[PDB]
Design a binder for this molecule. Structure first.
Ligand SMILES: CC(=O)SCCNC(=O)CCNC(=O)[C@H](O)C(C)(C)COP(=O)(O)OP(=O)(O)OC[C@H]1O[C@@H](n2cnc3c(N)ncnc32)[C@H](O)[C@@H]1OP(=O)(O)O
Ligand SMILES: CC(=O)SCCNC(=O)CCNC(=O)[C@H](O)C(C)(C)COP(=O)(O)OP(=O)(O)OC[C@H]1O[C@@H](n2cnc3c(N)ncnc32)[C@H](O)[C@@H]1OP(=O)(O)O
Ligand SMILES: CC(=O)SCCNC(=O)CCNC(=O)[C@H](O)C(C)(C)COP(=O)(O)OP(=O)(O)OC[C@H]1O[C@@H](n2cnc3c(N)ncnc32)[C@H](O)[C@@H]1OP(=O)(O)O
Ligand SMILES: O=C([O-])CC(=O)C(=O)O
Ligand SMILES: O=C([O-])CC(=O)C(=O)O
Ligand SMILES: O=C([O-])CC(=O)C(=O)O
Lengths: 273, 157, 273, 184, 89
């Protein structure tokens, strides 16, 4: 009653700018949900509205959807999928299994997206030529993130790096960082064929190019969004689909509790403490 | 036998349903009437488990029990002698009839609109048999300044 | 090398059927990723392949994308968004904040989808008329899940229940459970106007209809997928978008650590233990 | 300012009864921390104060400490330790690795404590003799929670069941449910 | 701490700082550890684990208290949130 009449004054402890649940209609960062469904923007458009508060062009939203598509799942042997399967075979929960799988993402599993994007952005902004970039990486004992694949090198490319790259050529206005990364790839493939642009590095450089090449963002906004971990969110949201699929598969197959065999553990305990 | 007195400064009532605004107004009326205890002892809401709803006694914070079943409310609060039925037209008849099985309840207030005349007639017959005074349905209730207030009677504070 | 020559026999401790990382191409439930992109299916198609191992029709995939869109975010005041914001303002991580937000997805928050779908499916299979279903729910002290709104009612609908419902009528071949839920909504709105079909209830009944009405699934498969928590995964995947958006917004606003006021806690500690 | 003058009301959205952060001294469910340490409480006493809001006897606190000690670890082959090791080898975090490991604590792994407690409490309250309980649970088809080991059967017990059992005989006043479980 | 209290009276050794310094002393002033072992244990986050394990007791106590009090679902009040959404994106 005193707040409606304006007798008292209480500071608000929270600030939000992505969604407005109150009112007669749900709003996604300025745009009503009905309007969100009118201009036929999809997962990419909703993701852009929620994460960047921007009306991204159609090609940007489709590219975001493609990035979510290619990072959906990459087999059960990875750490996150393995953890999801372990938590599912314990019969815990969907949320708990997805959570256990997601918690491994960020440093060695799934951290190559943001790391490659940051490395290539720093190289491009420093003004050094790709050969100087490769020499600098070699001299300080660091491997270029997003460069180098497992088996498929040339005359047999990743076949999902190719799809995203073809889309980027076809629809993106200008991609200077992608060109820089491709020159780096050309230099590295002269060393040994498997040194190609990975899906992580390609997605990172193309996402930076999308952020700082479309008219929605300024350079400061794109740099801040890269720094705060937009690509980490991209990878996590993409891989959540595969993790939930793994959980559902384990539930459908009705696999029992897993216990790692002792012949694989190699106890090295001290003699007596 | 219907008593000549229905409400006093020690009258305790049970509210049927989630009417936290009405109960809070009741408690405010009791506080401004210098009552020793709140007039609402418990609430009855079948669509939730037993818990305690948080209310205000003046500026102090108190807890009023909420029971899934009416029988528990009548068992744990034998001092209650008034039922204020906030059930709708489809539930007021059954709630009042079930309450009439308890002899501690002497006054029943029905707020619902649109109860069929046959059902209200049956309620009147059973109230006459059991000597229970019914504040007729389709009412806001009643007010006894200084002693008791029924529902939302008298408006806000 | 023994495994290569097959002189030894070791049973595999795991079993997966959703994705195939090994080989010359990444495979989603038996279908190559390049074929996934040529067929022009989006997030919905990959979701269907990974979760159900089925080639869903185009309208089913678009409906899945629609469901992910409408459940993207519903403001910062919900439990999950609140937890995500608290973890983000602690400066922890994107994965950690998303994790803390998603861990509240359960029966009270986010579980209205699966609960409503299961209840309506049970009512429809039992053969009882919608009025009998309403009476049965009333006499059991249970509220009809997926029915009732905060402020929305008849003559003032949700504006996102309407869009999904219109899509389902326009594109879905047959929706018996949706019709049953609409009769239930008609009965419940005669009690009080705000007792309309929720977003959760509408999505649940339409998802059950899409599972058991398209040619991809049999009745047993659809029932098992509903039981194991497919709609829980749908809601979690949808709301992870809004949770990551909340994390990014909190990072961009540079909000400090949250420290809950003492005047909203009401310490009720015992006198002396 | 309005709250200080007592001019307005705002209901509290929360309710706590285990710890009082405000004030001159930290309080654990009514007992000040200095009184907590002067009474020579341990992890068991603080656990009892924070979880049950009760002043548990010394033997109860020591038994709680022993229960925490015996459940400390059981190797890396279990699901939770496996998940913790997987998250740690990814170089993620202490909190994240502990979290991934703990999220497997449920019905199949780690829920046998509460499941066995509920099972035996229900059997004891029902009043049925242990033989009738065993026959009923055979016929109905559920395994008796808290019964059954792999390798340690007789003349070689779990040997950490023995420690807790000996402590319970020595210090616990009355153990009716323990006797019922031992008969089972 | 003496210097900081000379600056401002409430700049005392916190429980966090006291536990940290005393734990480092216990690590590297007992015969169990060499200096490099204590340094490695400090680096890898031994005190992070100490704090997490300690506060787990309080968190489980909070969970049990909320379950015993049967508190309902929480929804943060709209008056405590500042909506700064853009005009139209
Ligand atoms: C995905 C979904 O749609 S949720 C699906 C839930 N489905 C079910 O469980 C079906 C069962 N139905 C129900 O439980 C009920 O009918 C509900 C919860 C669905 C409808 O909500 P109600 O019971 O009316 O309570 P409601 O959520 O409106 O909240 C009560 C009041 O607090 C207000 N309120 C809501 N959130 C906040 C907030 N963060 N801060 C301040 N006030 C708030 C609301 O405006 C509402 O007032 P109003 O009725 O004037 O709008
Ligand atoms: C684990 C620990 O022991 S905390 C470790 C913190 N880490 C450090 O020591 C880093 C260096 N230290 C510092 O940064 C500072 O000295 C701090 C943050 C530790 C203390 O500085 P302060 O800002 O004076 O402390 P704090 O932020 O609690 O002060 C808030 C004031 O409001 C009160 N208050 C604190 N929390 C709340 C709350 N949730 N609701 C209402 N009032 C509160 C306090 O009584 C305090 O009193 P004051 O008004 O007399 O200052
Ligand atoms: C944290 C901990 O300490 S672990 C606690 C786990 N709690 C339980 O005891 C769960 C139920 N019991 C178990 O699973 C036991 O721990 C186990 C693992 C030893 C049983 O696993 P098994 O490999 O089946 O043991 P085993 O092969 O000796 O069992 C054979 C028979 O014993 C029966 N049996 C096994 N466990 C139990 C039990 N707890 N209660 C009753 N009967 C049992 C089985 O029904 C089986 O039936 P059969 O005679 O038709 O074959
Ligand atoms: O390629 C990916 O999407 C990430 C992955 O699973 C890996 O190779 O470790
Ligand atoms: O779960 C959601 O969609 C959010 C919601 O309804 C609420 O609690 O306000
Ligand atoms: O982890 C433990 O405490 C041991 C256990 O559950 C098992 O029997 O595998």
């Amino acid at each position: 009653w005193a707040r409606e009449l304006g007798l008292i004054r209480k500071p608000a402890s929270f600030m939000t700018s992505i969604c407005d649940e109150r009112g007669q209609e749900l709003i996604y960062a300025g745009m009503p949900i009905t309007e969100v469904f009118k201009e036929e923007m999809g997962i990419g458009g909703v993701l852009g509205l929620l994460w960047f508060q921007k009306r991204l062009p159609k090609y940007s939203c489709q590219f975001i959807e493609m990035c979510l598509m290619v990072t959906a799942d990459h087999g059960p042997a990875v750490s996150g999928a393995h953890n999801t399967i372990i938590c599912a075979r314990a019969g815990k929960d969907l949320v708990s299994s997805l959570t256990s799988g997601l918690l491994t993402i960020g440093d060695r599993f799934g951290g190559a997206l943001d790391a490659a994007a940051k490395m290539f952005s720093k190289a491009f902004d420093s003004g050094i030529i790709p050969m100087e970039f490769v020499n600098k990486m070699k001299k300080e004992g660091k491997l270029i993130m997003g460069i180098g694949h497992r088996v498929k090198s040339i005359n047999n490319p990743d076949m999902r790096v190719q799809i995203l790259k073809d889309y980027v050529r076809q629809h993106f206005p200008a991609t200077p960082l992608l060109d820089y990364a491709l020159e780096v790839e050309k230099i590295t493939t002269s060393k040994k064929p498997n040194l190609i642009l990975n899906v992580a590095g390609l997605i990172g450089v193309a996402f930076v190019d999308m952020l700082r090449n479309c008219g929605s963002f300024t350079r400061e906004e794109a740099d801040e969004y890269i720094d705060i971990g937009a690509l980490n969110g991209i990878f996590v949201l993409g891989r959540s689909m595969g993790f939930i699929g793994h959980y559902l598969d384990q539930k459908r197959l009705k696999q029992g509790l897993y216990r790692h065999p002792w012949d694989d553990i190699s106890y090295v305990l001290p003699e007596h403490m | 036998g219907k008593s000549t007195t229905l409400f006093s400064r020690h009258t305790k009532a049970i509210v049927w349903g989630m009417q936290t605004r009405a109960v809070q107004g009741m408690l405010d009326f009791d506080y401004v009437c210098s009552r020793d205890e709140p007039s609402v002892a418990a609430m009855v809401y079948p669509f939730t488990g037993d818990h305690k709803q948080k209310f205000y006694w003046g500026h102090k914070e108190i807890l009023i029990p909420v029971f899934k079943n009416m029988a528990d409310a009548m068992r744990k609060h034998p001092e209650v002698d008034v039922l204020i039925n906030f059930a709708s037209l489809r539930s007021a008849y059954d709630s009042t009839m079930e309450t009439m099985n308890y002899a501690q309840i002497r006054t029943i207030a029905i707020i619902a609109e649109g109860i069929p005349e046959a059902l209200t007639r049956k309620l009147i017959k059973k109230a006459d048999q059991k000597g229970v005074t019914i504040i007729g349905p389709a009412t806001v209730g009643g007010i006894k300044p200084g002693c008791f207030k029924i529902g939302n009677t008298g408006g806000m504070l």
